[PDB]
């Protein structure tokens, strides 16, 4: 039922990113939370790594755009600074 699960946004494998795989398997009977599971720890580390790449590539591109802007304004500044320093004489 993978295509149906994708159509509902719930991955395609039921062992993927849902509560059925990401909730803790057990807990102590008194009610204490169990130590975190190893696969879930690995998944959370990999998700942090992904999210940190999303922030970087966005901010590297969002920095390159403003660098391109701040360069074209300097080029148009050195194109608009066109005051003739001496004054035309001669046949005028």
């Amino acid at each position: 039922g993978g295509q149906w699960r994708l159509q509902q946004g719930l991955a395609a494998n039921p062992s993927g990113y849902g509560p059925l795989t990401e909730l803790p398997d057990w807990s102590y009977a008194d009610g204490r939370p169990a130590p975190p599971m190893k696969g879930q720890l690995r998944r959370k580390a990999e998700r942090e790594t992904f999210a940190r790449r999303v922030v970087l590539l966005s901010q590297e591109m969002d920095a390159g755009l403003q660098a391109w802007q701040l360069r074209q304004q300097k080029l148009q500044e050195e194109q608009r600074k066109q005051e003739n320093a001496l004054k035309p004489k001669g046949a005028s």
């Binding site: 990113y17 940190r52 999303v54 590539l57 966005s58």
Partner: protein, 120 residues
């Protein structure tokens, strides 16, 4: 003789009907691509194997984020037959430092910043 392939530039000139079929906005392009490898590099040229290694898609079905910049798109265009490109969508915005530990990518292609594992 078998060589590399120059793909005409028209293929990447998109149509308004293409926009309504795959809703994306020509003005305001999307910034980051979720690229997943969905075919092998075996039975394929060595240069296509080299690009899959460069793009970091050695494992199949493992998603990678890349820039929607002209240079990366050129490489993804030599391997477009062995991959799936989707736009990375950001509903609640870019992750923050206080939110970087509760993210999930989801099959819709939507990096959500708050994962709770609780019914709505």
């Amino acid at each position: 003789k078998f060589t590399r392939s120059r793909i005409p530039e028209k293929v990447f000139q998109a149509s308004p009907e293409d926009h309504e079929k795959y809703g994306g906005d020509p003005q305001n392009p999307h910034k980051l691509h979720i690229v997943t490898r969905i075919k092998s590099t075996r039975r394929r040229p060595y240069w296509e194997k080299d690009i899959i290694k460069m793009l970091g898609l050695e494992k199949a079905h493992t998603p990678q984020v890349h820039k929607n910049i002209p240079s990366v798109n050129a490489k993804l265009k030599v391997v477009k037959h062995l991959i799936r490109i989707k736009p990375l969508k950001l509903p609640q915005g870019l992750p923050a430092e206080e939110n970087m530990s509760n993210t999930c990518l989801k099959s819709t292609g939507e990096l959500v910043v708050q994962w709770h594992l609780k019914p709505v």
